Amino acid sequence: ANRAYPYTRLRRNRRDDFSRRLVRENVLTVDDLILPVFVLDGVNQRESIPSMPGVERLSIDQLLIEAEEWVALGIPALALFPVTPVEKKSLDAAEAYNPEGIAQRATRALRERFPELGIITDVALCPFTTHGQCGILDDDGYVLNDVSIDVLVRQALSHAEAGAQVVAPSDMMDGRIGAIREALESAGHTNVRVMAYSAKYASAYYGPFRDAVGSNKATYQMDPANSDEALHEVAADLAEGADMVMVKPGMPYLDIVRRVKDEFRAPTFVYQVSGEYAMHMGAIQNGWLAESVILESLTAFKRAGADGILTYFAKQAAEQLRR
Amino acid sequence: NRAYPYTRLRRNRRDDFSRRLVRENVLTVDDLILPVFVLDGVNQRESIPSMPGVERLSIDQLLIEAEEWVALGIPALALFPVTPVEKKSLDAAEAYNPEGIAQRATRALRERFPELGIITDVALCPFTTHGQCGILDDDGYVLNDVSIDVLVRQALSHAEAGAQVVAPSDMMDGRIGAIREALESAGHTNVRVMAYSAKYASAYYGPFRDAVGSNKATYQMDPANSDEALHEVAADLAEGADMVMVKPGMPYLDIVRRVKDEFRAPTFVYQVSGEYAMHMGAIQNGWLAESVILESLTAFKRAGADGILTYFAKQAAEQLRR
Amino acid sequence: NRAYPYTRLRRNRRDDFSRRLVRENVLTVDDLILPVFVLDGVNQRESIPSMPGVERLSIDQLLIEAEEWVALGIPALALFPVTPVEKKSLDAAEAYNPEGIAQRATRALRERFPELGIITDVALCPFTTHGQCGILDDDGYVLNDVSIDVLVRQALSHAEAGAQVVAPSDMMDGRIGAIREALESAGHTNVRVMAYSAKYASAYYGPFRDAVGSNKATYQMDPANSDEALHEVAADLAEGADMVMVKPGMPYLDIVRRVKDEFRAPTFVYQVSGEYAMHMGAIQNGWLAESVILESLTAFKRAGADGILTYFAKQAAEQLRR
Amino acid sequence: ANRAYPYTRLRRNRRDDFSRRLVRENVLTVDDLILPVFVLDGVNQRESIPSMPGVERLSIDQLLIEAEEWVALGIPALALFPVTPVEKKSLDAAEAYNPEGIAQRATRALRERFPELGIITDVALCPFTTHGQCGILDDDGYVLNDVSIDVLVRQALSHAEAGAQVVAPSDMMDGRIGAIREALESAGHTNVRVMAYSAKYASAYYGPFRDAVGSNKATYQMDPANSDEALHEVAADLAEGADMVMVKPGMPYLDIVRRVKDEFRAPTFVYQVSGEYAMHMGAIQNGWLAESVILESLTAFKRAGADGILTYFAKQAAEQLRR
Amino acid sequence: NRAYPYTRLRRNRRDDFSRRLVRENVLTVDDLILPVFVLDGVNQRESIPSMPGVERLSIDQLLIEAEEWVALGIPALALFPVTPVEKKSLDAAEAYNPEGIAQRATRALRERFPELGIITDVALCPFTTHGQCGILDDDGYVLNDVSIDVLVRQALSHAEAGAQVVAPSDMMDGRIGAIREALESAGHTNVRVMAYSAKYASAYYGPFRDAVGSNKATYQMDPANSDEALHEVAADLAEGADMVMVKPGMPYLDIVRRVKDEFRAPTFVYQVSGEYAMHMGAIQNGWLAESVILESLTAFKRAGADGILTYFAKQAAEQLRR
Amino acid sequence: ANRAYPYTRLRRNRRDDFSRRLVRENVLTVDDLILPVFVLDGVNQRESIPSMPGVERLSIDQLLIEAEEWVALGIPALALFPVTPVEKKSLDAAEAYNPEGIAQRATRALRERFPELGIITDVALCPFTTHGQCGILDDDGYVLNDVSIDVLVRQALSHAEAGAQVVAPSDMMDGRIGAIREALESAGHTNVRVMAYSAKYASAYYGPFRDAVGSNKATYQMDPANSDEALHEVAADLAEGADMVMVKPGMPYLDIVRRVKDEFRAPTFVYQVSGEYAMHMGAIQNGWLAESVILESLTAFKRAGADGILTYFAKQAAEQLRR
Ligand SMILES: [Cl-]
Ligand SMILES: [Cl-]
Ligand SMILES: [Cl-]
Ligand SMILES: [Mg+2]
Ligand SMILES: [Mg+2]
Ligand SMILES: [Mg+2]
Ligand SMILES: [Mg+2]
Ligand SMILES: [Mg+2]
Ligand SMILES: [Mg+2]
Ligand SMILES: [Mg+2]
Ligand SMILES: [Mg+2]
Ligand SMILES: [Mg+2]
Ligand code: NA
Ligand code: NA
Ligand code: NA
Ligand code: NA
Ligand code: NA
Ligand code: NA
Ligand SMILES: [Zn+2]
Ligand SMILES: [Zn+2]
Ligand SMILES: [Zn+2]
Ligand SMILES: [Zn+2]
Ligand SMILES: [Zn+2]
Ligand SMILES: [Zn+2]
């Protein structure tokens, strides 16, 4: 529109808080926050995670205790990540679909106690394989796509059976969203949402999560260099029946968030991963960055087009928003 | 290629949490601007029958009510003086009187509540004996460029009174650039200009005329025209507006959406007196639930508006706060 | 209509060769610009605690380290003088001192390494006693146009010292055109201007303030705003910038991508002190592998950046060379 | 953005090498190069090709020798083109799917020796027909589409059986990508890539290749005049399950490359064909053009949007890049 | 949703008639412009070894060959004088000599063949002792604005000689507007300007240098850059060019297509000496069929070019005529 | 691009023929022309058509005579329109698929005599029904869609059997392109093109054609007021397997031509119908318009994006072009 200085001075709107507030393009609210949480097998158990300062692994009872306050703060949903006892790992990943596995038990407990709180279970075989790869290995050590799906489908069904409102397949197998959706539909789980991890990269930013849960990748997770490829990933997942789509990691992939939102106009989520949390929190603890950087990081996801954010900062942010 | 039953759009609707996760727009108090009707005198409060629950207030009373507005976090007020009949003239000179209602109210509010935004109305219709939005020629037509000269003096007077934003509502061609030039020349470099860019010749304004004590088809836009609005806004952006506005509101949500999409600039919309009246009337009759107020406001957010001029601003801010 | 199992996106991922064939972006040393902190004096080297592995260097020491930078193929340096406290003033006059640190360092580097690009910082904050990015008025607000006058003299002084690029980081409106006019008028026809176009009011700058020995919401952009950045860059292109920049970096990759896509112009991004610190801290703690450095830089390429201002430039150039 | 001289002087960035380097939009790297290679039946055999100065036909053992250096140079992949003994040609093109045909043998030898090097086999009947047409002829002498596909499918399977990571159908039969993909999938060759020659023109630029391999076309290859048609070709091939799509010839069709990349955002390849190589090399040899024209020609493909380039200059370019 | 076997793209290919019906582009003689090398003297004809079948011709001989060109319907010639070594100078003054080869040839052709288009080359490289495309400063760099002054005088001299089109090939910034202003000021209101807008620093020019008897990376474009070309052409259109050109040709067909698509303006492309040589060489060796000539030219039409500067213009016009 | 007078004077290019020629955006050639022709049942028969001055109905032998010259002129194709004897009309339209109907006979005669000339047969029931409606009527007098298709399919097969290279379904039944394509494919007529009359309007401009062939419509032909609807029509026909798509009438619908070409980038044809021919020719004959209006009318179709034009002026235009 031929806007030219000095007729246009972009500073005028910035002059006063009230005008800054009037033109502010995006706001983060508690509607936008999803808290991931590492769940242990026992009773009366909490563990600190070395590479995620301030985040605890919680047994189910402890989860239920802390969830009262997450609920009170208005956090809409949790994303559960079980911490599988080593003795329950196997080459067939069968613990994935064990009806009394951690995820399944946590889910039923939370669904009963906090009926309005959303529960997003993780559909993935890496927490359950003795080797830690995101699926069933062939003789060469390659992750078999279609065979891994069969396990994933049985897992997802078990989650729906436990009452999960959302299942989130994080594996990066091709075709899995459609196979899971078909199974859910066949089984009558009409309303179970599927939150696809659509554009999940082969990233160095996951380091701490491995420490958190107790666990090559380039043959299934995406190359960091690729952008256009992410749109093809998403497109397939929407076609296959995903209700929501996700980019992971998050800040390092904000451009992807923006392209995905712009291209598909579908419910788009983003994961501020363990390494992102660790680097921010470590800097805040060292006195190198102000705590205000938490809300800045989260505001960036909204600005980029995310509808919702999986973030280990969800409770702190909710607290800050509520002020 | 999303297809039922693989895709069932009800799934995200099943639970409040999922509805919240996917909700595309939120209204907040940061979106609300309260228009106010300002009387001369002291201790004056007058009800408006066609705008139930809205009062015209003298300045002292405005300062009192403003305590609450500020407490609720409403970012700005839009002042509309109720000009005494005796102060109306052919030349509209009260528009730039340093002792006019708008200028006095501005000075009062700027002092008492320094963080509150004040948006003054730049317009000659409140000041003319004939009520037209400008100075007439000998054929009874509103002269564009001569009217701008008066508008410029008004705008300068508002800036001198401390207004952070002036909002030209006149629909004169070229007035945004002329006002901008004048502001700049005078050293008022940070006074915002909130252009009423796409202001339609509308029947929705009935009650406001009641409220302020006052056809426009040779200046106000034809309701039928939509492309025309883009041309209006493009010129006002080129001429230096800091924000652009569509008026009326809800009957023109398509315009809001086109303007936001085309220009990606700060976009405002006026939910006019007629809109407020319609909704109030229906609520008071028990024909609509009070929930319609937040619905109407959410519409503006959804259509692309950054801010909303609305007589519901206090009612809504209270509901949002809680 | 690509659909599984006819389309399996894993197939190109199966082998390194195919991953290489389809790889959409590559980082090279041609993408790297090293910011440097420059001290007055001789034989000075100072570690920065909040930026582990980065030192502030006096000019003689800078010349020494620069041998390696040049050997590694780093195309340019961005100089940031560490102004002695005694040289800060209300008028920011050290900004245009021919004997200032920046001007001296420029002259030294231009002579010793004629092919190395030197990008000077055009900004008044390093030179004011109050640390604000300009000259204050009597209300304590940074005056836009008066600050530009000082910026213009600074920019001319950098050109006189031989800088091939000046990078205005101030966030004054209109400053790119004013600097351009001045450069042109003076015969500095080929001095590039690298506008910091979309520079946000960010918490990520903490460590830099430590490094150079120094709110900005009335000039720096609101983190929440994205469309606004397009307007910023459009003006700076119109005003004559040769390259445009987004700052900070990684928290604003969406902005980089929007700016590249909209304008198709040379686009740069600053991976700021806070970003470097976060990553370094996590690497030193064993929380992240050192591979994150090239990942972070690749992100900027993927988002559309042509060049990256990064304190990792040497570490990355070494890794790329090998 | 209203950029106007003298405020905008596009020469400023060009003033110095460092700024030229900073704004340079595209770079060619060895990641972008695919070397086509003509493979003979014997042992200890090399032949010079008259119309491709500097390019040799190589027996398998010789191929393995030269490949050490292609590998050392970082060339990611080869595209194999067998030189069929005349005695092995027939009206049924059966040699195409012979498990001990040249392509199959070369493939197994290279897969074993250089496991990381990509092998792209040619799925085409023209090297195998007594007549040299790209398929099986009917009584009128027309190339039968669906009957030719059946042979092509058997060929592609035989290549996957030999270990090829990519099969590249170059025939221009309609529907072939889907038929090959279905067959590969049915057979369990889940990860064998299909590099479709999607927009392959009826071009005069192929002349030397006929000399190289020892071999109307307008009823299957595209009319040079047509652009929009190429987008329809590509679209079908992506829908049919191609992993990569290719334009051939290359320089003479750079506009097609750009439209294809822009429209589909998919992995896009381009073939700098025998006639392009010959005309450049002949000019360089005559002293008419500088050797720098090699990297200029290849940079154009990147600039146009190609991800990868099949080029007889791959070794020379790799050498030049490595300096 | 076109899908095999319902859609078989071979069907339209089955028969020549259907191929003709659907053919998207045709080359005609109206698309061809013949560049010519012009010698001083009388009765001179010189073969160029690196451009087999092309001769440099003195003016009298050019007039003779032109009879055939005109008979074949070739719309225009692009004249390239072969400057005597003794007429080259630091100041490039032969460029605007009314008695220069270009000016004489123009006058001769305008008289003898009034309907034939004459496109003169506006450029200083044929006239400088050093061969650079402009006037050098004391550092050996081509001064942009001083070179334009000489270019303007050249262009005026071509207009005075009767040229219907001047084609600035220099790659000076701003030269199209400066030449346009001058033409307009002088009353040359209908002299076309054919800007070489996107002219790359290319190895394809080798033979031309042979032909006319003569790095450029500080003015000619980097082969790697494509977005940059849009900026080049946008400026030249704004500055008043009537047609815009890409050079070289076939190695830059993506550029042609981007330029046509973006601007929808008259777009021309130069199939340069190196391109002609490559093709000729291969044809003479029996490596390519002569059909490649029409294929190469069709490519330019397909990419979006309106006109093609090509040394094959006569060969192709003969083939088309028949 | 900020082009402004007097720096930009759009007249400069117009100053001289040579520059007009250089920038001329579109050219009509004989490659673009398709001649419709009304074919009678007899021998040695020609009839003049009152409302189409200058156009004759021709028996097959006469058609073959005139076609030598159409061929000599380079006209690529004819579109045949038989003139059905009244005695051969019926409620079932069976004459449509009679192997010795006029169209079928003309086709075989022309295919044999002029093998390179394209023949486009008309797939339509209106020339064959006693009532003249474009299909089989129900009790209410409505044209039954799916029942009419069955006849159309049998017609099209009979045309392919006669050797037609293109069949052109002009009926405006929904779904017909797909049904015809399926049938052709099932029958092995792999290469028979289908030229869909995709956007065919309920127009007053067809008046003379009824006079020519010897023959409500608003329930199948399109409303003249509708534009967007034409894109939906076309889209369906491409999806159903049309090789070419057509707009009819022509000049009065040039906007449709442009939108269709722009939207689909597919081979697009346009019919300059009988009423368009009549009004031009009547004006030329009255001395009201110059003959140059013929090439102007045809140039408009090219300008609008048409690849080919069905026009009763094809011979005159070809003659004019050849000069
Ligand atoms: Cl007026
Ligand atoms: Cl200011
Ligand atoms: Cl210069
Ligand atoms: Mg307890
Ligand atoms: Mg996927
Ligand atoms: Mg207006
Ligand atoms: Mg700015
Ligand atoms: Mg040996
Ligand atoms: Mg195909
Ligand atoms: Mg230029
Ligand atoms: Mg006879
Ligand atoms: Mg239809
Ligand atoms: Na949200
Ligand atoms: Na707002
Ligand atoms: Na770069
Ligand atoms: Na590549
Ligand atoms: Na042309
Ligand atoms: Na055509
Ligand atoms: Zn996993
Ligand atoms: Zn008014
Ligand atoms: Zn600053
Ligand atoms: Zn073949
Ligand atoms: Zn030159
Ligand atoms: Zn019909």
CSV table of C-alpha atoms in Angstrom, one decimal, chain D residues 146-302:
chain,number,residue,atom,x,y,z
D,146,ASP,CA,0.2,-51.8,-21.6
D,147,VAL,CA,2.0,-54.8,-23.1
D,148,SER,CA,5.3,-52.8,-22.8
D,149,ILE,CA,4.5,-52.2,-19.1
D,150,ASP,CA,4.3,-55.8,-18.4
D,151,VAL,CA,7.9,-56.2,-19.5
D,152,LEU,CA,9.0,-53.1,-17.7
D,153,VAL,CA,7.5,-54.5,-14.4
D,154,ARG,CA,9.4,-57.8,-14.8
D,155,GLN,CA,12.6,-55.7,-15.4
D,156,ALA,CA,12.2,-53.5,-12.4
D,157,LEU,CA,11.6,-56.5,-10.2
D,158,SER,CA,14.8,-58.0,-11.5
D,159,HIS,CA,16.7,-54.9,-10.6
D,160,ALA,CA,15.3,-54.8,-7.1
D,161,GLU,CA,16.3,-58.5,-6.8
D,162,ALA,CA,19.9,-57.4,-7.8
D,163,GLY,CA,19.9,-54.8,-5.1
D,164,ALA,CA,19.3,-51.6,-6.9
D,165,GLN,CA,18.1,-48.9,-4.5
D,166,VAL,CA,16.5,-46.9,-7.3
D,167,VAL,CA,14.8,-48.0,-10.4
D,168,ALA,CA,14.3,-45.2,-13.1
D,169,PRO,CA,11.6,-45.9,-15.7
D,170,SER,CA,12.6,-43.9,-18.8
D,171,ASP,CA,10.1,-45.4,-21.3
D,172,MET,CA,7.3,-42.8,-21.3
D,173,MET,CA,4.5,-45.4,-21.2
D,174,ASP,CA,1.4,-44.1,-19.5
D,175,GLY,CA,0.7,-45.6,-16.1
D,176,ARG,CA,4.0,-47.3,-15.7
D,177,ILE,CA,5.0,-45.8,-12.4
D,178,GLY,CA,1.9,-47.1,-10.7
D,179,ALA,CA,2.3,-50.6,-12.2
D,180,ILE,CA,5.9,-50.8,-11.2
D,181,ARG,CA,5.2,-49.5,-7.7
D,182,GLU,CA,2.4,-52.0,-7.2
D,183,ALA,CA,4.7,-54.8,-8.2
D,184,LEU,CA,7.5,-53.7,-6.0
D,185,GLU,CA,5.1,-53.4,-3.1
D,186,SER,CA,3.5,-56.8,-3.7
D,187,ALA,CA,6.9,-58.3,-3.9
D,188,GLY,CA,8.1,-56.7,-0.7
D,189,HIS,CA,10.6,-54.3,-2.2
D,190,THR,CA,9.2,-51.6,0.2
D,191,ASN,CA,12.2,-49.3,0.0
D,192,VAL,CA,13.2,-49.4,-3.7
D,193,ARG,CA,12.8,-45.9,-4.9
D,194,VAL,CA,11.2,-45.1,-8.3
D,195,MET,CA,12.8,-42.1,-10.2
D,196,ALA,CA,10.3,-41.4,-12.9
D,197,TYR,CA,11.4,-39.8,-16.1
D,198,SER,CA,8.2,-37.8,-16.0
D,199,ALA,CA,8.7,-35.0,-18.6
D,200,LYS,CA,10.9,-36.7,-21.2
D,201,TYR,CA,10.8,-34.9,-24.6
D,202,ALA,CA,11.1,-36.0,-28.2
D,203,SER,CA,14.4,-34.3,-28.6
D,204,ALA,CA,17.2,-34.0,-31.0
D,205,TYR,CA,19.6,-33.7,-28.1
D,206,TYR,CA,19.8,-37.5,-27.5
D,207,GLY,CA,21.8,-38.2,-30.7
D,208,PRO,CA,25.0,-39.3,-29.0
D,209,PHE,CA,23.4,-41.6,-26.5
D,210,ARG,CA,22.3,-43.8,-29.5
D,211,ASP,CA,26.0,-44.0,-30.5
D,212,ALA,CA,26.9,-44.8,-26.8
D,213,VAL,CA,24.5,-47.7,-26.3
D,214,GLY,CA,24.2,-49.0,-29.9
D,215,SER,CA,20.5,-48.3,-30.8
D,216,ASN,CA,7.6,-42.6,-34.0
D,217,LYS,CA,9.2,-41.4,-30.7
D,218,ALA,CA,6.7,-38.5,-31.0
D,219,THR,CA,3.9,-41.0,-30.0
D,220,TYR,CA,5.2,-41.3,-26.6
D,221,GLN,CA,7.9,-38.7,-25.8
D,222,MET,CA,6.7,-35.1,-25.3
D,223,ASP,CA,6.5,-32.4,-27.9
D,224,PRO,CA,9.2,-29.8,-27.2
D,225,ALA,CA,6.7,-27.0,-27.6
D,226,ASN,CA,4.6,-28.1,-24.5
D,227,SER,CA,5.0,-26.9,-20.9
D,228,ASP,CA,1.7,-27.2,-19.3
D,229,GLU,CA,1.6,-30.9,-20.3
D,230,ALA,CA,4.7,-31.5,-18.2
D,231,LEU,CA,2.9,-30.6,-15.1
D,232,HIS,CA,0.2,-33.2,-15.9
D,233,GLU,CA,2.9,-35.8,-16.5
D,234,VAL,CA,4.5,-35.1,-13.2
D,235,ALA,CA,1.3,-35.0,-11.3
D,236,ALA,CA,0.4,-38.5,-12.5
D,237,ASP,CA,3.7,-39.9,-11.6
D,238,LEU,CA,3.6,-38.5,-8.0
D,239,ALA,CA,0.1,-39.9,-7.6
D,240,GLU,CA,1.3,-43.2,-8.9
D,241,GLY,CA,4.0,-43.4,-6.2
D,242,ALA,CA,7.3,-41.9,-7.7
D,243,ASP,CA,9.8,-41.0,-5.0
D,244,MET,CA,11.6,-38.5,-7.4
D,245,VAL,CA,10.6,-37.0,-10.7
D,246,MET,CA,12.8,-36.1,-13.7
D,247,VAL,CA,12.9,-33.8,-16.6
D,248,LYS,CA,14.9,-34.9,-19.7
D,249,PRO,CA,16.7,-33.3,-21.6
D,250,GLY,CA,18.0,-30.6,-19.2
D,251,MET,CA,19.4,-27.2,-20.2
D,252,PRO,CA,17.0,-26.9,-23.1
D,253,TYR,CA,14.1,-27.5,-20.6
D,254,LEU,CA,15.3,-25.4,-17.6
D,255,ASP,CA,11.9,-23.6,-17.6
D,256,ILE,CA,10.3,-27.0,-17.1
D,257,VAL,CA,12.5,-27.8,-14.2
D,258,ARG,CA,11.5,-24.5,-12.5
D,259,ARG,CA,7.8,-25.0,-13.1
D,260,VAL,CA,7.9,-28.6,-11.8
D,261,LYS,CA,9.8,-27.7,-8.7
D,262,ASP,CA,7.5,-24.7,-8.1
D,263,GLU,CA,4.3,-26.6,-8.6
D,264,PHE,CA,5.0,-29.9,-6.7
D,265,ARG,CA,7.7,-29.2,-4.2
D,266,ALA,CA,8.9,-32.7,-4.7
D,267,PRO,CA,12.4,-34.2,-5.3
D,268,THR,CA,13.2,-33.1,-8.8
D,269,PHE,CA,16.0,-34.3,-11.1
D,270,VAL,CA,17.2,-33.3,-14.4
D,271,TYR,CA,19.2,-35.1,-17.1
D,272,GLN,CA,22.0,-33.2,-18.8
D,273,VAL,CA,21.9,-35.5,-21.8
D,274,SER,CA,24.5,-36.9,-24.1
D,275,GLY,CA,24.0,-34.1,-26.8
D,276,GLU,CA,24.4,-31.4,-24.1
D,277,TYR,CA,27.6,-33.0,-22.9
D,278,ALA,CA,28.8,-33.4,-26.5
D,279,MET,CA,28.1,-29.8,-27.5
D,280,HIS,CA,29.9,-28.4,-24.4
D,281,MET,CA,32.8,-30.7,-24.6
D,282,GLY,CA,33.3,-30.1,-28.4
D,283,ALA,CA,33.3,-26.4,-27.8
D,284,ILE,CA,35.8,-26.7,-24.9
D,285,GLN,CA,38.0,-28.9,-27.1
D,286,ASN,CA,37.9,-26.5,-30.0
D,287,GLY,CA,38.9,-23.7,-27.6
D,288,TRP,CA,35.6,-21.9,-28.2
D,289,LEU,CA,34.4,-22.0,-24.6
D,290,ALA,CA,36.2,-22.0,-21.3
D,291,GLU,CA,36.1,-25.0,-19.0
D,292,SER,CA,34.3,-22.9,-16.4
D,293,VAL,CA,31.2,-23.4,-18.6
D,294,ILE,CA,30.8,-26.9,-17.0
D,295,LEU,CA,30.1,-25.6,-13.5
D,296,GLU,CA,28.0,-22.7,-15.1
D,297,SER,CA,25.8,-25.3,-16.8
D,298,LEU,CA,25.4,-27.3,-13.6
D,299,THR,CA,24.8,-24.2,-11.4
D,300,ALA,CA,21.9,-23.4,-13.8
D,301,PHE,CA,20.1,-26.7,-12.9
D,302,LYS,CA,20.4,-25.8,-9.2
